[PDB]
Amino acid sequence: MRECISIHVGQAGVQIGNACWELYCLEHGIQPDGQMPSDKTIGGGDDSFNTFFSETGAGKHVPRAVFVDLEPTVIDEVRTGTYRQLFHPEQLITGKEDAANNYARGHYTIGKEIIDLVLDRIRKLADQCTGLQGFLVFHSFGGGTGSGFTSLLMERLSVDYGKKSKLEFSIYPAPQVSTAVVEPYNSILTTHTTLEHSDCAFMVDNEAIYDICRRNLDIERPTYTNLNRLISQIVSSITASLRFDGALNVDLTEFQTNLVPYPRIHFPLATYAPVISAEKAYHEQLSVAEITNACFEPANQMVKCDPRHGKYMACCLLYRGDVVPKDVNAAIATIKTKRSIQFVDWCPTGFKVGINYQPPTVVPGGDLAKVQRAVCMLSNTTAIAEAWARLDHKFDLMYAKRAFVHWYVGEGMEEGEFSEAREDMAALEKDYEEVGV
Amino acid sequence: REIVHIQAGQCGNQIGAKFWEVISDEHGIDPTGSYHGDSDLQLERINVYYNEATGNKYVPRAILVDLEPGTMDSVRSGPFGQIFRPDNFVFGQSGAGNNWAKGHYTEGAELVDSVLDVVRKESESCDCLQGFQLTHSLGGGTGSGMGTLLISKIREEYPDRIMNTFSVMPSPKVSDTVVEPYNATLSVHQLVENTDETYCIDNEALYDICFRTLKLTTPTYGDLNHLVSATMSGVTTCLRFPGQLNADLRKLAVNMVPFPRLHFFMPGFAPLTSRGSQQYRALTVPELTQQMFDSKNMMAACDPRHGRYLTVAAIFRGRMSMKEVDEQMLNVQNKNSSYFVEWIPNNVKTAVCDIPPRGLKMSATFIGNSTAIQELFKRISEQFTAMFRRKAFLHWYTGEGMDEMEFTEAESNMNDLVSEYQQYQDA
Amino acid sequence: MYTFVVRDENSSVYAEVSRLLLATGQWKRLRKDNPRFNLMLGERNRLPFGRLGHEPGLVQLVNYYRGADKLCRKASLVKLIKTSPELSESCTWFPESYVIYPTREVFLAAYNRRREGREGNVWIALISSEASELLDFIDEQGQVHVIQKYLEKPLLLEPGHRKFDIRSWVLVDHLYNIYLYREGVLRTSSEPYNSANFQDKTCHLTNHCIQKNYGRYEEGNEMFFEEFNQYLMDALNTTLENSILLQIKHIIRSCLMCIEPAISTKHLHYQSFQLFGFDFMVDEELKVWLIEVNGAPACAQKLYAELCQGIVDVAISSVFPLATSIFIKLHH
Amino acid sequence: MEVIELNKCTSGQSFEVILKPPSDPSLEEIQKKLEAAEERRKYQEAELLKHLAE
Numbered sequence A: 001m002r003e004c005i006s007i008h009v010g011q012a013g014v015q016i017g018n019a020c021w022e023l024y025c026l027e028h029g030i031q032p033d034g035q036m037p038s039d040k041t042i043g044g045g046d047d048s049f050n051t052f053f054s055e056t057g058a059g060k061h062v063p064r065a066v067f068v069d070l071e072p073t074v075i076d077e078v079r080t081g082t083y084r085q086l087f088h089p090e091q092l093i094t095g096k097e098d099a100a101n102n103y104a105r106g107h108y109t110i111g112k113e114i115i116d117l118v119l120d121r122i123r124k125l126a127d128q129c130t131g132l133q134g135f136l137v138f139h140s141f142g143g144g145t146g147s148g149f150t151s152l153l154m155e156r157l158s159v160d161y162g163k164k165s166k167l168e169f170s171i172y173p174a175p176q177v178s179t180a181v182v183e184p185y186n187s188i189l190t191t192h193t194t195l196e197h198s199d200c201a202f203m204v205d206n207e208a209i210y211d212i213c214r215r216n217l218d219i220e221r222p223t224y225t226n227l228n229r230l231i232s233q234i235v236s237s238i239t240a241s242l243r244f245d246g247a248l249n250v251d252l253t254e255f256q257t258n259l260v261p262y263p264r265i266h267f268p269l270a271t272y273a274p275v276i277s278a279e280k281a282y283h284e285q286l287s288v289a290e291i292t293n294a295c296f297e298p299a300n301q302m303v304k305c306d307p308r309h310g311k312y313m314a315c316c317l318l319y320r321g322d323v324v325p326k327d328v329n330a331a332i333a334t335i336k337t338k339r340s341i342q343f344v345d346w347c348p349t350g351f352k353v354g355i356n357y358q359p360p361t362v363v364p365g366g367d368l369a370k371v372q373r374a375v376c377m378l379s380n381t382t383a384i385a386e387a388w389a390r391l392d393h394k395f396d397l398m399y400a401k402r403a404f405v406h407w408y409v410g411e412g413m414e415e416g417e418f419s420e421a422r423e424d425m426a427a428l429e430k431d432y433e434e435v436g437v
Numbered sequence B: 001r002e003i004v005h006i007q008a009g010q011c012g013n014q015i016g017a018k019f020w021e022v023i024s025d026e027h028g029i030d031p032t033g034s035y036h037g038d039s040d041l042q043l044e045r046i047n048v049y050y051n052e053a054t055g056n057k058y059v060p061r062a063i064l065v066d067l068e069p070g071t072m073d074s075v076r077s078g079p080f081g082q083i084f085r086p087d088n089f090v091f092g093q094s095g096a097g098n099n100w101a102k103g104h105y106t107e108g109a110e111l112v113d114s115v116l117d118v119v120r121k122e123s124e125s126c127d128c129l130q131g132f133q134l135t136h137s138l139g140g141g142t143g144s145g146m147g148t149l150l151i152s153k154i155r156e157e158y159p160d161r162i163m164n165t166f167s168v169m170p171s172p173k174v175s176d177t178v179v180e181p182y183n184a185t186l187s188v189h190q191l192v193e194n195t196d197e198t199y200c201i202d203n204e205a206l207y208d209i210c211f212r213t214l215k216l217t218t219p220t221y222g223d224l225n226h227l228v229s230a231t232m233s234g235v236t237t238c239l240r241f242p243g244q245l246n247a248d249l250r251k252l253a254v255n256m257v258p259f260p261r262l263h264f265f266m267p268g269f270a271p272l273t274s275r276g277s278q279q280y281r282a283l284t285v286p287e288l289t290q291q292m293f294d295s296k297n298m299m300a301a302c303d304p305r306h307g308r309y310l311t312v313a314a315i316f317r318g319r320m321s322m323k324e325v326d327e328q329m330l331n332v333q334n335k336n337s338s339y340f341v342e343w344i345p346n347n348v349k350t351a352v353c354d355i356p357p358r359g360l361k362m363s364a365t366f367i368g369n370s371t372a373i374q375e376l377f378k379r380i381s382e383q384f385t386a387m388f389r390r391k392a393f394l395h396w397y398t399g400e401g402m403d404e405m406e407f408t409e410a411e412s413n414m415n416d417l418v419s420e421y422q423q424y425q426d427a
Numbered sequence C: 001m002y003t004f005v006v007r008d009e010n011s012s013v014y015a016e017v018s019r020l021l022l023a024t025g026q027w028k029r030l031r032k033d034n035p036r037f038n039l040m041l042g043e044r045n046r047l048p049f050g051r052l053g054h055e056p057g058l059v060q061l062v063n064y065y066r067g068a069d070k071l072c073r074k075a076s077l078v079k080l081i082k083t084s085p086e087l088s089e090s091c092t093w094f095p096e097s098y099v100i101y102p103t104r105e106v107f108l109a110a111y112n113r114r115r116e117g118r119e120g121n122v123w124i125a126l127i128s129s130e131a132s133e134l135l136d137f138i139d140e141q142g143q144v145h146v147i148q149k150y151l152e153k154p155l156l157l158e159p160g161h162r163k164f165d166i167r168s169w170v171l172v173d174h175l176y177n178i179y180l181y182r183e184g185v186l187r188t189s190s191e192p193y194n195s196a197n198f199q200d201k202t203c204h205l206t207n208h209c210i211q212k213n214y215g216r217y218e219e220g221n222e223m224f225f226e227e228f229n230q231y232l233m234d235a236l237n238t239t240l241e242n243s244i245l246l247q248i249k250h251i252i253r254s255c256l257m258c259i260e261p262a263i264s265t266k267h268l269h270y271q272s273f274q275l276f277g278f279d280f281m282v283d284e285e286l287k288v289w290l291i292e293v294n295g296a297p298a299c300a301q302k303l304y305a306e307l308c309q310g311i312v313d314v315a316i317s318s319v320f321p322l323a324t325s326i327f328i329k330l331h332h
Numbered sequence D: 001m002e003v004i005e006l007n008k009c010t011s012g013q014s015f016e017v018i019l020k021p022p023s024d025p026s027l028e029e030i031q032k033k034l035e036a037a038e039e040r041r042k043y044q045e046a047e048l049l050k051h052l053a054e
Ligand SMILES: Nc1nc2c(ncn2[C@@H]2O[C@H](COP(=O)(O)OP(=O)(O)OP(=O)(O)O)[C@@H](O)[C@H]2O)c(=O)[nH]1
Pocket: A009, A010, A011, A012, A013, A015, A016, A070, A098, A099, A100, A101, A102, A106, A140, A141, A142, A143, A144, A145, A146, A147, A171, A173, A174, A177, A178, A179, A180, A183, A206, A209, A224, A227, A228
């Protein structure tokens, strides 16, 4: 067995970690006090769920997780919340004043003061790992901590853990839930600095999660709690292979092997279906062909874009629930004839599939309904580059007037780092352009 | 995240006292500083403006400053004067004589260290100080001259904290003395360099709102201060109550201020209300949105249609449909897209608070970084040069040691401030 | 009030639509790069489709279909027909065509067949009768041109032995309803037709500007539908609908329902409509052929008033309501 | 079409269906950028405390 350490940075990372780890506990039959009756190997084991939970002689199962925010308000809720007994406090790391929506403040000013502490607390988890494969980093693009301190941390993990893989769950900024007018700055600055240090990054556009919660869950004004419980299902779908017995995506290195043929282009598009409301109890259960078909409707994508006007480099289907391979191949054949699925000439037009028979689990009293089968498609399509153009345009609008640049220079950053980052992004859009036409 | 409040001068302490009246009442604190309230949401963020004293009494983290004892003696005898810490009263005796030079260079200098000592005593006991807020006027001497002296000295001792001011701009419609344009022009030069956020509260606009909209024929300073204490409760709502934004003074400056000198906001309030007279017909959210962007509700006599909004922050208080708020805020941006700069995307922000202000079922406070604020500084700059090119009344200042140069300089820096606001108005 | 922006100022058509839209009191024009628009009259180079549909509280509509270039670019039009089993094998209405790259086998593989069958071996890019006169000619250009059969037996109006082509204007809305404008135009060559030595430039290649004569028989070389139907009636004992229009409606329906699953905005975050312009040719057997598709079209000065209004009625105000028909819905 | 590499478990199974074939910085250099910005932080602050001295 090979352990994976999850790192949650900033408010978005912390709160989504709460969402994921609560769901992970329900999937594995682990109680808020850490006890897992179904676990007979007490105090140890090389089972698959031990990839994410270590064990104590007292029978407690503890997440291989670390939580870091430059401010205590969000993590103090973890310290006092329903799962307070899950984590030992050395895993919960807080500062005293946040990065004030500023990448430069999160990376240089406050980050330099706490980076060594975090890496030390991370080393405590790595020294309980007989074979560590890498890290799962949860952060936002828009916050000062989520953007500034993550790129600092990611630079350092390449140094201390050079050969270990690093995956990102990144929250792409959306006006509908926007915390700052400078989030395009923070997004471009962080992506440029982190790009060489991330092996696979799943971008989740908050605008997508918002509309999905509004359309399919009939929630007029979704909360962070609404958004994060949806995201945790998508995250759970992606990590399930690491926590359960299976043949597909067993090591973190398989994510880059199956999804990332080109190093810079390592942002797969996640699509998830079905999202059905818990209040709507009268329901009609969707077949394999119905949920697979939804993976190519952009309304179910974690980023709004048009895959039809782009080329695919890799495509995985992660089914959970009552699914058999025969129904999968039949559904694929139907869809292949009716949709614009162009692949690049240098990659096979195949689909990698994995199936877990345990149907998706739902939080009791949640907004998501219990379904018989679900699917999560991971496609590396050039169409995701639309998100970069959107972000880079907003960057270009403000930077032309050097608006708000003084808050960043006032932390030690140079105006030239803005131009470095934007050129890198400009190259990234060109790299996506070559592959897609 | 605690704030240290400072009020200086006549105008400073009067709007200062009413502010503490209003927000004490909102937080359910009595003149004796004892909590008699009905919701723990009143206490969740009470530490921002209140220290927890012995016996679980609450004492404003407030410093009262003046160069004569008159106004501060009145505060102590006022409705809530007993809630203030007596050591935080710091007065002189001879007064500043509506003279910037007396507050800034001579008479204020004797007293300034005694204030900073009280400031330090309050900051030292703060878990994590975020910054300061100063209430004052720019037309007199103590609040205008000594206030800007404290600001420069507080910046010296706390250079990485936020400096917030509620600065009352002078108007001939409400004029104490002919030298008010001299005092304001000297104070604005200081505010440009040593504040992060300044609320331009124009007495010209408060008069017009009292006279025209409220139908008050001869309004007092107490009628104007009623408008000020309502605005100040508004702009401090996200500080004093819990919300989604995790609001602090720094994030406000980061998002409001695209360029460090252009940090002069126009406040606005809706609905507009007179004293004692109550309004029984509550408003529709379309009415709240429409009024708060209407020039008739702006606390600075500027026409926002004569400029362009760099950033806007709106805060709604009351029980209302936030979907309707979003729909209505999006409506005015989309209907008036020409009056928002297109090179700062998503430059309007909306927060909501369930707790309404005493009196109204729902209110709305407006904060705007408009380039039309140059109209206010142009007004001061004209009134200034009308006297200055005859060196009129300048003896009042040279007698206190000042030079003609320091006036010429302040004239230029403000004229520069005007041209910068015009730079980004014509983009 | 609704809002729109204008990002193609040379649009002969949508110049009029913005005029009509403003002249309603319910539409305001913003600055080109203002993002808070309800409608976009976008450009023709790199229309930023990726930035559409991301404004909160804004239903965004645009006057172009992302991906319709493959129908409006000749090289891709040809590639679309040879590959799509919706049009394959040989759709009896498209001229046998080939794409040629300048510095290929199949072009010669059948060129022999039409001299060794002694058949009609004329082709078109400009024109010629020998291969070398165009292959070497395309190599002179550098831009990749297409090559295809030249219809040597054109239908000819009388008097004058006049060669013409037909342009029908088609409007597709966000619902992918196909609206054929009831009023078309014939761009007739005002000069009689040469049939053997075709090195003469403009004697037979009909373009509205290449004839620069031009404006003689009827104003602007433009015969409208009411006259062309009557000529066929009196000179051929038939109608424009039966002889020609049934095929025009077939080809439009065929071409547009082909690329429908690729450009539809049925469930997109932005909606899309687009006005197309099809160019047809008719031979002496009364047989309609597809010349080219023009995705950025222009109308005739007699019809702008009526067409540029029907765009507002059925393609713009159907998404942005305010407070008989001139189109023919091609059902599919 | 072609279903391959099917591995069955008790929790589920996996396979791969094909439709057609094809046609870092150093810890040293980190501080030389980190610490180089704490200095610009202090140069700017010194120029402020100097300007306040005047
Ligand atoms: N989906 C989701 N998005 C969030 C959540 N919290 C914040 N965001 C988004 O994250 C962006 C800001 O990132 P934050 O996490 O709040 O910033 P931070 O990491 O705390 O950094 P600081 O500025 O120092 O506070 C905004 O665009 C929000 O839309 C969350 O819980 N769920």
